[PDB]
Point group: C5
Chain length 311, copies 5
């Protein structure tokens, strides 16, 4: 079966629509998500047109094998989608109405710059390659773009699922290729990050600053070193659930900054002890007393600067 | 093939049933479970009618390809079910009795609010989409809904497997959809959490409170810090076997609360030492003596408050 | 093709056999194992009978598609087996001899009560569903049940592979089902657990008891706490390679008991120090001296009691 | 269908091209990467030639089954490529223009010698085996070799995707094989390694060197031992994300060198204490004072030597 | 299609050959490896013989479906191989020359006794089952057994790939089976284990022995305990990348031995302190002085004994 011939020299408009049934497995490291949805396609094939009076039927149903069907592919998929044709309906004028249900692992990159307070725009790119006979062009039927209310992405809030109505038409290997951009806007559920990593990470840091109320070098060493080991554990746990970014992230910045605070506390603890042994604890006292205000004030201001730069 | 034609204007009732053979792999992080079960379907196709006098047989057998079979799909599956048609039997009136055995990764969300003392209601949604010729409607044959006695879901107790007999009939992309809700009620076996996670977590917390019977700042720092690190390990181990919830969980609350208890013990240990050095151990003694009763009493009451809020 | 018709009203006996080629991947958490084996089936279809003098041939070979073959399934498999028909041979009387080679992920539960000194009975359940024409019943041909000598299950000793000759015949969805139980008896190779997990766990416990020969509260705190953190690592390592059991296991008991020993040592270390500070080291000495005998004696007796209860 | 016959006994030149759609999953340990791309093939089959004036058509489209298609196979793939024929076009002369879209897990080794400041050359090898009728030879059509702008490999910069135009023709099992080398040049984005692994690893090393300003053996033991445990965690974290190389890597060197610095600091801390106890702290002072300059200077020079050897 | 009939009563000799293309993923815990290779088969079928004069052709090419092809299987594979027939050529005398390219997960056990200085012999077993018509026997065509030069097994050196020319002919389920043994000899690249696991493990042990030059019980406890924890981390990192063996391994022995050295050092540290407190440091001094020579000497001799027993 060949593509429907043009009346004049017009391209064949294939109207598309994606209706999300299930959205799942959003992998941050892999920058992938899984989607189970309906794909609807509609085009006019005049060869399939009929008289409802003569045929007695208002709609004719066909098996895929029986008629010409446009080769639609997804651009950003790991492997080609698992599809099951649900229905093919031909109206009397020849307007084919194709519907299939598919599942695909979509590969769409994420911007971790504001993590875990980030929002994302996931993309699903539909594509058709023109044939020799005639050029195929994609269109969006907004009445057939959606998601069911129950669609739930674990750990994310689904804001919108819309399509960019104007396709990106371009040459690829001397043939036209009509590309459509379906956008799924999601925003991260940061609630858990607060009681789970943020607050515990801050408490173990504040526990380290109790060394500013102690003269016991042995206890201070223990305090600042032990908490630094706890911070290493947090920093490992955080970074292992994120991909290696060529840009600095908000969480990355915070984690790095905290390492400097530990390093500078070790230096303070060291200086204080050196002076006490040198029989000059008056200098050590003034240094320690300053640190009690300095460390929190600088930490607080540095965070204000950081949050400001990132948001 | 086309769907069986209506005698009058009635929809085609497809009677369904699911009989669970093996229900396994319930993944808490993924909020998915695997199921291997029988799917039974029964509908009338008068076209298939026969005389057993002429045909010789009292029941006719068919290959799926040979007759019209309703396109039944699962709503909440990762990928389309792996099915194997077990049997297709047509009685003289044209009543079809279809049976297949399938396997599926069902994606049904869990409520972790009372974890590990939570119960769940897993869902398996059956759906049929109406055709142009006639409307298809799902029904439940309760004689064909069940589970074998041996069905075991590791670390869960299977309470019931029932179906919500009245289907959810609704429009979707200008066609009728008949949706059935199969409910598998399970409850978590929390036994292991007690000797494994709970009691060890409580002993290492009580071990830290022995610092209320010591004056050695160096030993107290060691005690409270070391046990804090043990609790960091605990919390990570617990937290990595749960998904990131936008709501606070019972275990999450307990774990968070325990972090405050360590932070407040570090403060007590710090205050006690400061006073000892300040040559006023009478204040330090009274503060420490209070802490011995305070810490357990407050911990016990806080837990009573927490358990109350969550159950 | 319909099933072979009965001479009288007898059921069709399908003789079965499983000959294990490879046994691998016994996952303890998942309570699954992978199997690669031959499945042999034999039944009499008189329609296929021939004269060996007239046909010249002793045996006729058929393609599966050509003749009626009973739909045999495995009950306890994750997904349906990957089979390849090796041979179909028909004798003059009409005795069909079918042979296929298959692979499957069997889901058979384990009893962790005596782990790592446990033995298991893995099950492979064969099942046939009766048809409307006639009832199919399974049988065991013991001459076709076995395993090759080289079958090796890593970290397990294969004792026997036998079949329970009497099938479990029962009604399921108003049709007869004939179920056969194939039992693979294995016993765990516990050797490695001794130099790997057991002895190191016991040494780090005995290391903590050296605090009974020390008066240094700071050194005892260090000793008992450090060894406790090592035990936490041991316990996590052990329990992450086991599923969550609703029953107490031998290893689980030992691990929990050891936790108590650390808690009670912390108490001893605390009491000894309190008394030393209270200027009464005579009581502290007698308490410590007792602990030196008490701790090992109690540990040894508690283990005798435990081993007795579990074996 | 047999291969096209030669006019004069020349080999059949199959012109090839690979246009990368998506690059993903570069696994360093596995030395594998995944690709989704277009594969274009073009050859002359005179049997397929037609008249364009008489036939009215300038191009004829065929189903793969209809014509002879050269068996093109990737050398370095885990399993054979998933492919979907996009189009087959025949020009009047009989020039076939085949296009398929495929996915493959390519196995191309990496050189970890300069990690994480390394660049790589990934390979995709195309191969054709000659037939008895005639020899098939591969060629590169540079106008059909490329990648889309959006191709992104997470944590890697894509430099170029080119082909080595001259095929490696050789005998294999008494038949000619024509092999083509497609090269994808990538370079690691090392940015993240600096705030994440490098700077933290250097700070915990510098923290250990504060023991050169302390006389407290107990505090020095704590300092050097604790920071050493931190380095063990770092080194384990780094080494588990790399394969076992028979050559020394840049990071491997750095990590190993750092272990010696900790061993030599333990020795210094030990010597200093021995002398202090031996009532000769003048020697201990001079040894410690030297170490303060020695340790950083030697560390800095050793790194200059190392970086020089590796780059 | 039936098997070729015998001229006399001779068995049908199927000549085989395996030429390795890519050898990857050798999993130590699983005792498996992946292989991608050519499988060549050749047998005489006189029914296929032809006159090269009357046919004009010197070789006839067939589709698998067209002719009889022996059912060749691999014994030790997880699931049946993924094959693609490359070519089927019939010479005038009727000699079929079949060639396919396949991929398989071969399950061949490893001997970890000398790990990481071990060598292995991986096996690939080819098998054919005899039919009632005639008994099929495998043979090795040494000209068709090999590997390409580029075959690389990450972290292993490929020594040889040979076949044991004499097949193991035996009865299995009342039919003969002809089994061939293909042996791939590999040896582990132990280089990395030295800077990575061995030297760091030895240095953290030597760091513990500095407690023989200290009188500070608190510092010795810290030293011997901290290092013991580092050895636990090592011992896990090692053992988790190895399967549970019923035999003692070289690395297992070394690791176990080192645990005794830590236990005995804790005992020494304990005894030394007890005596110091007992106001008899002359005994403590002589015990400590002995330990300084004893510990390394015994460690060195124990290793010589161990290496001797294992190599
Ligand atoms: C250690 C540092 C502690 C973390 C501080 C919060 C970071 C922040 O300031 O987060 C800010 C984000 C909101 O960002 P947004 O509105 O979605 O971005 C859009 C921004 N525009 C205007 C640039 C487009 O989250 C919050 O509401 C913060 C609530 C969490 C508080 C946790 C405190 C502990
Ligand atoms: C009497 C002193 C009470 C101290 C209360 C501590 C408040 C911490 C609030 C954290 C809020 C989040 C930032 C934490 C610093 C640790 C404080 C050390 C206290 C030293 C006691 C001196 C005794 C006179
Ligand atoms: C540290 C915190 C200690 C944990 C306290 C147990 C939590 C609890 O009280 O858990 C309660 C759950 C039962 O809940 P349910 O009946 O299934 O819920 C339905 C409840 N409604 C419908 C009436 C609201 O388990 C138990 O029987 C508790 C046994 C575990 C005791 C562990 C002691 C240590
Ligand atoms: C810490 C405690 C150390 C563990 C002590 C061994 C437990 C035990 O007693 O184990 C018992 C099992 C034997 O099991 P079985 O004979 O097959 O049981 C069947 C018994 N019936 C049918 C009579 C009921 O193993 C052994 O022979 C123990 C060898 C390992 C000793 C390691 C010591 C270190
Ligand atoms: C007055 C002393 C100031 C100390 C400044 C420390 C600079 C650290 C530079 C890190 C560069 C990145 C190099 C790590 C050694 C830390 C030195 C500890 C200070 C000793 C204090 C003696 C008090 C008189
Ligand atoms: C002057 C002392 C020099 C110390 C040199 C140490 C050699 C270590 C060689 C490692 C072999 C690889 C085996 C390591 C033992 C630690 C030695 C403790 C030194 C005690 C110093 C006493 C001060 C007088
Ligand atoms: C502890 C050691 C700290 C690491 C020091 C950097 C290693 C290095 O010197 O790295 C060098 C590489 C660049 O290598 P290249 O130009 O791509 O190689 C081609 C070389 N030719 C000429 C041989 C062909 O990266 C950099 O630009 C270094 C930036 C990171 C600095 C991190 C400092 C903290
Ligand atoms: C002179 C005393 C030698 C002690 C040898 C220790 C035997 C341990 C055998 C365990 C076998 C497994 C149970 C281990 C207890 C630690 C013993 C502490 C010794 C204290 C020394 C007091 C000096 C008089
Ligand atoms: C902790 C103790 C340090 C480890 C000692 C090495 C073990 C050994 O001596 O190993 C020996 C193996 C060689 O074994 P093979 O030649 O393949 O066996 C053939 C044996 N015959 C003769 C019985 C057939 O490795 C080596 O070449 C040693 C290099 C590694 C040295 C690392 C030292 C640090
Ligand atoms: C589960 C949660 C509270 C948690 C446990 C342990 C450690 C950390 C980091 C913050 C150090 C953490 O996120
Ligand atoms: C997760 C479970 C197996 C576990 C093991 C050992 C100790 C703990 C405490 C410290 C939380 C624990 O939670
Ligand atoms: C490899 C082996 C000796 C090992 C190392 C570290 C800890 C454990 C036990 C204590 C769980 C262990 O099994
Ligand atoms: C360097 C090494 C010790 C390390 C520990 C913990 C966390 C990180 C990053 C996230 C800072 C890290 O790379
Ligand atoms: C002691 C040994 C098992 C070990 C510990 C930490 C780091 C490494 C390498 C990466 C140096 C290592 O293999
Ligand atoms: Cl697609
Ligand atoms: Cl489906
Ligand atoms: Cl099955
Ligand atoms: Cl391929
Ligand atoms: Cl096979
Ligand atoms: Na079509
Ligand atoms: Na059908
Ligand atoms: Na300490
Ligand atoms: Na059949
Ligand atoms: Na073809
Ligand atoms: Na084809
Ligand atoms: Na064949």
């Amino acid at each position: 079966v060949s593509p429907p011939p043009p009346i004049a020299d017009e391209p064949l408009t294939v109207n598309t629509g994606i209706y999300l049934i299930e959205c799942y497995s959003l992998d941050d490291k892999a920058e992938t998500f899984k989607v189970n949805a309906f794909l609807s396609l509609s085009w006019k094939d005049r060869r399939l047109a009929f008289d409802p009076v003569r045929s007695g039927v208002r709609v004719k149903t066909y098996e895929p094998e029986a008629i010409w069907i446009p080769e639609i592919r997804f651009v950003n998929v790991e492997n080609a989608r698992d599809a099951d044709v649900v229905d093919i309906s031909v109206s009397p004028d020849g307007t084919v109405q194709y519907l299939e249900r598919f599942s695909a692992r979509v590969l769409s990159p994420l911007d971790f710059r504001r993590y875990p307070f980030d929002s994302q725009t996931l993309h699903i790119y539909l594509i058709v390659r023109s044939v020799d006979t005639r050029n195929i062009v994609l269109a969006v039927d907004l009445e057939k773009v959606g998601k069911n209310d129950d669609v739930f992405l674990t750990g994310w809030d689904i804001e919108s699922f819309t399509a960019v109505v104007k396709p990106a038409n371009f040459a690829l290997e001397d043939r036209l290729e009509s590309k459509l951009d379906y956008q799924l806007r999601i925003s991260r559920q940061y609630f858990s990050y607060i009681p789970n990593i943020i607050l515990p990470m801050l408490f173990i840091l504040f526990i380290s600053w109790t060394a500013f109320w102690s003269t016991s070098y042995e206890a201070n060493v223990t305090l600042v070193v032990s908490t630094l080991i706890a911070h290493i554990a947090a920093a490992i746990l955080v970074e292992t659930n994120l991909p290696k970014t060529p840009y600095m992230t908000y969480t990355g910045a915070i984690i790095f900054m905290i390492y400097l605070f530990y390093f500078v506390a070790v230096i303070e603890v060291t200086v204080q002890h050196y002076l006490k042994v040198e029989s000059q604890p008056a200098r050590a006292a003034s240094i320690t007393r300053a640190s009690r205000i300095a460390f929190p004030v600088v930490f607080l201001l540095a965070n204000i600067i950081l949050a400001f730069l990132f948001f």
